[PDB]
Every structure is written in structure tokens, then in C-alpha cells.
Design a protein around this nucleic acid. Structure first.
Ligand SMILES: [Mg+2]
Ligand SMILES: [Mg+2]
Ligand SMILES: [Mg+2]
Length: 223
DNA sequence: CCTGTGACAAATTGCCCTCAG
DNA sequence: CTGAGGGCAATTTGTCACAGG
């Protein structure tokens, strides 16, 4: 049963926001949204090194490294919602540790309604589905794909490439499409195919000499 | 203009070790 | 013993010159 892992349920506004974060910063982001979901919430969240190591198959010393550098790298990271245009900071206070092996973070109290969206306008996935991805961009794509998933784990969706560049905030050399192909599309599609239960194919949409959309579709291995 | 590949750079990976308390 | 530190080589991500349709 896929039901063994936490159920991540985020608003589609988050699924579609424009931001940069590392794999490690996102692994934590999942744990934070879970914890608001279980409370009039105020923004204080807690992380235990020992538990984070259970969850991601890591050693105690390595989990401490990953948390400690992620938490430092939130400084100056804005998140932008869209159309619409609203920019917020993730943390309003620096994180700190009062007990050995435990950190206390203060997430911005305005983001919470953006996490807990309006009814039937939301994305959802088990934590197991995404814990073995490595590339953060491959994590963004798996999120967006999940947004279109029917009850039976199948779906089809067309994303415009300029929109992928803006929301996933991809590096500049990928505006030149042979590089986008080689260092993002093939790498992220292979990863979903090897690390998740999803089975993914795609076709490109040219207009004139240009490529403008990727047309993704997928079934679940439970077929 | 469009494409793919080779090369170099800079970054991320899981892993090894000391050491404090 | 846990976990806060330092460090590593190997691999993957990011940049871009060159050659062909
Ligand atoms: Mg990153
Ligand atoms: Mg609390
Ligand atoms: Mg690491």
C-alpha cells in the first residue's frame, strides 16, 4: 500500500509558484506543510535530526549536515504567486536549535492560506512517491504532473516552455532549447521513470521553426 | 534561424573521520 | 551513543564554441 507515507496536500497556487529551492530545502518543505495541516496556526515548526534520518534513509551525521546548510540557505529566498504577482519571504526569523538534535523554524505567517487552499483546487501525493528523487527540477515537474492526476493515477497535460522556465526558475542557458532538452527534459523524465511509481512519456509541439509546449502524459505502474 | 555533441567549470552527491559531552 | 564539525573523489548540473540542416 502506497498509503504508508505521509499525505502531502498543497494548494495549486504553491504547485505553480515561482521559486528556487534545493532538493534538501524541499524535503523539509514537505515536512512543514504536513505540520500546519494538523492545526489557527502560528508558523512555528520543528525538525528532529533523528527522525529526518529515518525518513530519507540517511545517517545521523549526514542528516545534521543537510538540515544545517538548508536552513542557512533560506535567507533571501522569496516565493512569488501568480494572473497575479505577490512576493513573500519564506522565513521571518533565523532558525535555531534549543535541544541537541532539534531545530525550530519560523515560517512566514502569510503563506499558510497559500498552503491550505480552497476546496477542490489542490495537489496531493504520498511522501514515498517523491523521497528518492534527487534533482529539484524533477521534483517540480512531478508535482505539476500530480496536479492533473485522475483518481486512477493517469493523466495528460500540456505545459508551455516559457512557463516552465519562469515558475521552476530554470538557469539561463536552458533558454537555448538543445540544452533544455539535454540537461532538464531527458534528466527529469528518466528520473520520474526510475524513482517514482509514475510512467511518463512526452511529445514536443513545434510552431514554425520553434518548440513551444511539452505535452506530457502518464499512467501508474499499478496498471 | 534551428539542431546535437565536446569541452571546461562549478556544483552536488554519499561517504570517511574527529571529537564533544 | 548521537550529532556537530571537517574533508573527499566521483558524478551530475550549467555554460558555450563549433559543425551541420
Ligand atoms: Mg539548489
Ligand atoms: Mg507547535
Ligand atoms: Mg547531503
Amino acid at each position: 500500500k502506497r498509503k504508508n507515507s505521509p499525505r502531502i496536500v498543497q494548494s495549486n497556487d504553491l504547485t505553480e509558484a515561482a521559486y528556487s529551492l534545493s532538493r534538501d530545502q524541499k524535503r523539509m518543505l514537505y515536512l512543514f506543510v504536513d505540520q500546519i495541516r494538523k492545526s489557527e496556526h502560528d508558523g512555528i515548526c520543528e525538525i528532529h535530526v533523528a527522525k529526518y534520518a529515518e525518513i530519507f534513509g540517511l545517517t545521523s551525521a549526514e542528516a545534521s549536515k543537510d538540515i544545517r546548510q538548508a536552513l542557512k540557505s533560506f535567507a533571501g529566498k522569496e516565493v512569488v504567486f501568480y494572473k497575479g504577482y505577490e512576493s513573500f519571504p519564506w522565513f521571518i526569523k533565523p532558525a535555531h536549535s534549543p535541544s541537541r538534535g532539534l531545530y525550530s523554524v519560523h515560517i512566514n505567517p502569510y503563506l499558510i492560506p497559500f498552503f491550505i487552499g480552497l476546496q477542490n483546487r489542490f495537489t496531493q501525493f504520498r511522501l514515498s512517491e517523491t523521497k528518492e528523487i534527487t534533482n529539484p527540477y524533477a521534483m517540480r515537474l512531478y508535482e505539476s504532473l500530480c496536479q492533473y492526476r485522475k483518481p486512477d493515477g493517469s493523466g495528460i497535460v500540456s505545459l508551455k516552455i516559457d512557463w516552465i522556465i519562469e515558475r521552476y526558475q530554470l538557469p539561463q542557458s536552458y533558454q537555448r532549447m538543445p540544452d533544455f532538452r539535454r540537461r532538464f527534459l531527458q534528466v527529469c523524465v528518466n528520473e520520474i521513470n526510475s524513482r517514482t511509481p509514475m510512467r511518463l512519456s512526452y511529445i514536443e509541439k513545434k510552431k514554425g521553426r520553434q518548440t513551444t509546449h511539452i505535452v506530457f502524459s502518464f499512467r501508474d505502474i499499478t496498471s
